From Swiss-Prot:
Signal peptide, first to last residue: none
Protein name listed in UniProt: Papain-like protease nsp3
General function of this protein: Responsible for the cleavages located at the N-terminus of the replicase polyprotein. Participates together with nsp4 in the assembly of virally-induced cytoplasmic double-membrane vesicles necessary for viral replication. Antagonizes innate immune induction of type I interferon by blocking the phosphorylation, dimerization and subsequent nuclear translocation of host IRF3. Also prevents host NF-kappa-B signaling. In addition, PL-PRO possesses a deubiquitinating/deISGylating activity and processes both 'Lys-48'- and 'Lys-63'-linked polyubiquitin chains from cellular substrates.
Membrane topology: Multi-pass membrane protein
Subunit text: May form homohexamers. Interacts with N protein.
Localization terms from the record: Host endoplasmic reticulum membrane
Full-length numbering of the shown residues: 1025 to 1191 of 7096
Natural source organism: Severe acute respiratory syndrome coronavirus 2 (2019-nCoV)
Mutation effect (residue 164 to L): In strain: Gamma/P.1
UniProt catalytic activity: Thiol-dependent hydrolysis of ester, thioester, amide, peptide and isopeptide bonds formed by the C-terminal Gly of ubiquitin (a 76-residue protein attached to proteins as an intracellular targeting signal)
Activity regulation as described: Inhibited in vitro by GRL-0617.
Residue ranges constituting the Macro domain according to the UniProt record: 1-167
Length: 167
C-alpha cells in the first residue's frame, strides 16, 4: 500500500492520473520523482522548469554543480539528485527531444532507468516540448518499466486522449 490517490490502473504496475507532477509531489512526497531533464540539466520549461521553480531554484543550483563535476548526461541516461522539498530523490531522466533533432529509439533506454527504483512518480517521457508522440511514449513506458510507476499528466485533454486510446 502507498499513498498515491485517484490513479487509474493501466497494467499490473503502471498507473495514470490527470495532475501536475509538482502537485502530486507536494502532496505525496514520494521516494522518487522523475524529472524530464535535458543533458545539461538546464531546467527551463515544461516539467523541469516547473519542478525547479517549485524548489525555489535549488534544483538548478544543485544541477549546475553536478554538471561542473561530471559533465553532461547522455540522451537516454539519468542521474539521481536531491528531491529538495518535493521528494526524497529526483531521478533526472533524459528522453530524446525531437524538436532538437534527437533520436526517438532512445526512449526505451530512457524508461529503463525507472527499473532501478521500486516506486516512482513520473511524467510521460519525451512528451510536451520534447516533441514526441505521447501515445507512443505511454506504450514504451508500459512495455519497458517493470517497477511501480505513477504517471502524472498535467494536460487534461491529453489525459483523456491517453486513457481513451490505451491498448
Ligand atoms: O501534460 C503532460 C506533460 C506534457 C506537457 O503538456 C506538460 N506535461 C506535464 N506533465 C506533468 N506535470 C507537469 N507539470 C508541468 C507540466 C507537466
Ligand atoms: Cl512540456
Amino acid at each position: 500500500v502507498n499513498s498515491f490517490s485517484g490513479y487509474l490502473k493501466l497494467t499490473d504496475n503502471v498507473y495514470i492520473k490527470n495532475a501536475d507532477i509538482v502537485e502530486e509531489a507536494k502532496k505525496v512526497k514520494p521516494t522518487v520523482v522523475v524529472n524530464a531533464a535535458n543533458v545539461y540539466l538546464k531546467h527551463g520549461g515544461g516539467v523541469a522548469g516547473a519542478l525547479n521553480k517549485a524548489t525555489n531554484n535549488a534544483m538548478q543550483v544543485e544541477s549546475d554543480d553536478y554538471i561542473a563535476t561530471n559533465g553532461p548526461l547522455k540522451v537516454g541516461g539519468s542521474c539521481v539528485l536531491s528531491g529538495h522539498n518535493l521528494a526524497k530523490h529526483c531521478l533526472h531522466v533524459v528522453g530524446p527531444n525531437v524538436n532538437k533533432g534527437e533520436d526517438i529509439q532512445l526512449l526505451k533506454s530512457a524508461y529503463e532507468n525507472f527499473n532501478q527504483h521500486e516506486v516512482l512518480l513520473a511524467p510521460l517521457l519525451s512528451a510536451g516540448i520534447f516533441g514526441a508522440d505521447p501515445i507512443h511514449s505511454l506504450r514504451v513506458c508500459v512495455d519497458t518499466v517493470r517497477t511501480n510507476v505513477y504517471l502524472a499528466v498535467f494536460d487534461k485533454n491529453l489525459y483523456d486522449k491517453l486513457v481513451s486510446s490505451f491498448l
